[PDB]
Amino acid sequence: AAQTNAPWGLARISSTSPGTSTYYYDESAGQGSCVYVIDTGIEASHPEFEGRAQMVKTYYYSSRDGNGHGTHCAGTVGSRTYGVAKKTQLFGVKVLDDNGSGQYSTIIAGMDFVASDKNNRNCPKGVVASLSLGGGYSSSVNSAAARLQSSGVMVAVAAGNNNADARNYSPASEPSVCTVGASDRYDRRSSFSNYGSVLDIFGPGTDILSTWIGGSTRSISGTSMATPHVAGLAAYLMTLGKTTAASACRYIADTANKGDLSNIPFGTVNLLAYNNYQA
């Protein structure tokens, strides 16, 4: 299948070179996989989700996304127009308040929640969790992210937006999960993206169009936008039988576009998420 005039990052992920505008993907489109978006929530009524999204848990007064950040990320995973995995199932877990902020004990609780809740849901092709959040190093946060991964969920986390080594941020610094850096439309590392040996992969994160609250859309930037391209891609590959939750990050790295990016510091992987689609 082909989506013409796609957002650039969806094109980038199905091409060996930059500058194309068509997203080429298999029709299966992540059908039968599930992605948990652990964030500010998801506006599930947005037309672009087509009834495929729902809130399953909130740690605040309401389950509503009063911010937009979670809706945007969810959109890049699995919205019709803006998503990598256009037929996946989205579940929203609200660990961040409507200012985009959250305590570490709540974030941890949210990851433990997903590990359990997945056993109650029908996800025959597998389970993915997208965590477009982070702060300073915490061994407990890293530990929760490790638990979620070892549960059998493909965990994808943002590297962070400090133009620094990701080793000092969590859950970015947990080795066992899939730590995602950001690139721009010219195949440069995004000027804000963290880097370092703990990064596993890069994805598109500068000027990413996606769904917003109030039924709208908008284009924002960050490692937060790169993470759901990778989470979506994982879902899409698992539905294809190409990989499993335990090895998806490694599979994505082994099948990535190698060496295309510029401004990658020495010791950081130069690998950009790629679907390898061939009609």
Q: Which residues are annotated as a binding site for Ca(2+)?
A: 16, 175, 177, 200, 260
Among 87, 151, 260, 268, binds Ca ion (CB under 5 A): 260
Name which of residues 166 to 205 contact Ca ion (CB under 5 A): 175, 200
Among 16, 101, 139, 191, binds Ca ion (CB under 5 A): 16
Packing angle of the helix pair 139-150, 104-117 (nearest 10 deg): 10
For residues 223 and 219, what is the distance between their CA atoms, to the nearest angstrom?
A: 13
Q: Which of 14, 132, 173, 224 is catalytic?
A: 224
Q: By C-beta, is 39 or 174 nearer to Ca ion?
A: 174
Per CB under 5 A, the segment of 14-22, 28-36, 86-94, 240-248 that binds Ca ion is 14-22
Q: By C-beta, is 12 or 52 nearer to Ca ion?
A: 12
Q: Is residue 29 within 8 Å of 233, Cβ to Cβ?
A: no
Q: Which of 69, 98, 210, 221 is catalytic?
A: 69
User: b/e string for 137-169 if b means 16 or more Cβ within 10 A?
Assistant: ebeebbebbbbbbebebbbbbbbbbbeebbebb
Residue 72 among the catalytic residues: no
Per CB under 5 A, the segment of 56-64, 89-97, 156-164, 254-262 that binds Ca ion is 254-262
Contacts with Ca ion: how many residues (CB under 5 A)? 5
For residues 217 and 47, what is the distance between their CA atoms, to the nearest angstrom?
A: 11
Q: By C-beta, is 215 or 267 nearer to Ca ion?
A: 267
Per CB under 5 A, the segment of 15-23, 68-76, 134-142, 163-171 that binds Ca ion is 15-23
Per CB under 5 A, the segment of 76-84, 212-220, 228-236, 250-258 that binds Ca ion is 250-258
Residue 224 among the catalytic residues: yes
Pairing of strands 135-136, 169-170: antiparallel
Pairing of strands 169-170, 216-220: unpaired
User: What residues are designated binding site?
Assistant: 16, 175, 177, 200, 260
Q: Is residue 144 within 8 Å of 107, Cβ to Cβ?
A: yes
Residue 39 among the catalytic residues: yes
- The nearest distance, CB 149 to Ca ion, in angstroms, is 9
All residues at 6 or more sequence positions from 121 whose CB lies less than 8 Å from its CB, including other chains: 34, 89, 91, 127
Residue numbers of the site for Ca ion (CB under 5 A)? 16, 175, 200, 257, 260
- Active site residues per annotation: 39, 69, 224
